[PDB]
Structures are given as C-alpha cells and as structure tokens.
Amino acid sequence: GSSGSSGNNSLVPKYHPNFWMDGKWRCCSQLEKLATGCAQYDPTKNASKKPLPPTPEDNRRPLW
Ligand SMILES: [Zn+2]
Numbered sequence: 679g680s681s682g683s684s685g686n687n688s689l690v691p692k693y694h695p696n697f698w699m700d701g702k703w704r705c706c707s708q709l710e711k712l713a714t715g716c717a718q719y720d721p722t723k724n725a726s727k728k729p730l731p732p733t734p735e736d737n738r739r740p741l742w
Contacts, residue, residue: 691719 692715696705706716 689714691715693717693719 694703694705694713694715695717696703698704702709703713703716706713708716
C-alpha cells in the first residue's frame with residue numbers, strides 16, 4: 679500500500695496571476711473554461727534550488 683506519482687508536462691508551467699470574470703480571464707483574457715496558465719513560471723523568484731542534471735548511460739544493453 680502506497681501513493682505518490684508524477685507525470686510529464688507538455689508546455690511550460692504557466693499560471694493565472696489574475697482572476698476570471700466576464701466569461702474571460704483578466705491576465706490573459708482567454709476563451710477557454712480550463713484555460714491553462716498564461717504567465718510562465720519564475721526561475722529566480724522562488725524559495726528553492728536544484729543541482730545540475732546527472733549524466734546519461736552508454737549504449738543500450740540486455741537484462742540478462
Ligand atoms: Zn491568465
């Protein structure tokens with residue numbers, strides 16, 4: 679028994695820095711009910727840091 683999984687993203691993780699009114703957003707003013715964030719995330723503006731990515735492996739190989 680357990681729980682906790684992660685998926686993959688397609689487009690930069692945006693957000694709505696404004697509210698939605700008048701059948702349309704205020705920050706982006708989109709025309710979709712599930713309109714995805716418009717403002718792109720912020721690399722600097724944050725309270726966390728991540729190290730550099732690891733290195734890949736060599737040519738494929740069987741599992742025997
Ligand atoms: Zn927006």
